[PDB]
């Protein structure tokens, strides 16, 4: 078992020094957005909260070392920084998870791509798509094996761009804006082109 791990560093061009960090990276803000919700409220991903804590502690240590605090306080600050970084990478792994309002644990980096939710199984292997609809089904006994009955409104919504093109090129609308306006109000000329 030990050789399984040791051989990886031996038979490669990488050193195990990477397990100790001297500079933690920061994700771009857009992936942790601070969006101004309607009415002036702000919604923030809790990830950027974790980061803040790290920085705070990392600042305090820099102060304590500067003025020569007793070794006990410096060691306590170093331990706190270690725990903060650990929770940033993986919250709740070692100790009790960090919680904000209420009692719900914060979502760490690992949680963003860990399980059923996240990115791998929720945003990479399968995703929501445009030009799609859904509706209840009923039996059509007069249909052929290769035919299906599509509601008028659903078909219009699905084919809106094609309908707009066929409206503008047939001189029903003078431009794309006029064709879109005509389709939204569903004037009679739309249904002739839809079929």
């Amino acid at each position: 078992k030990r050789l399984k791990v040791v051989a990886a560093f031996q038979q490669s061009g990488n050193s195990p020094m990477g397990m100790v960090l001297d500079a933690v990276p920061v994700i771009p803000p857009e992936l942790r957005p601070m969006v101004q919700l309607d009415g002036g409220r702000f919604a923030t991903s809790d990830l950027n909260d974790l980061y803040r804590r790290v920085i705070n502690r990392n600042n305090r240590l820099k102060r304590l070392i500067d003025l020569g605090a007793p070794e006990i306080i410096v060691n306590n600050e170093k331990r706190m920084l270690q725990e903060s970084v650990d929770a940033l990478f993986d919250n709740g792994r070692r100790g009790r998870p960090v919680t904000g309002p209420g009692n719900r644990p914060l979502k760490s980096l690992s949680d963003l791509l860990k399980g059923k939710q996240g990115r791998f199984r929720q945003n990479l292997l399968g995703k929501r798509v445009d030009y799609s609809g859904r509706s209840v089904i009923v039996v059509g006994p007069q249909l052929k094996l290769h035919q299906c009955g599509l509601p008028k409104l659903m078909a219009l919504e699905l084919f809106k761009p094609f309908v707009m093109k066929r409206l503008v090129d047939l001189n029903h609308a003078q431009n794309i804006k006029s064709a879109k306006r005509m389709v939204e109000r569903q004037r009679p000329q739309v249904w002739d082109v839809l079929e």
Binding site: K127, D130, G133, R134
Partner: peptide, 29 residues
Amino acid sequence: KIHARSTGPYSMITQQPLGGKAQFGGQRF
């Protein structure tokens, strides 16, 4: 329960279509 979609709002981060009839929800593939 009939809504269809051709183009609508997208997500902030993943930039994928939103879901639900409340918005112009896209069907999940």
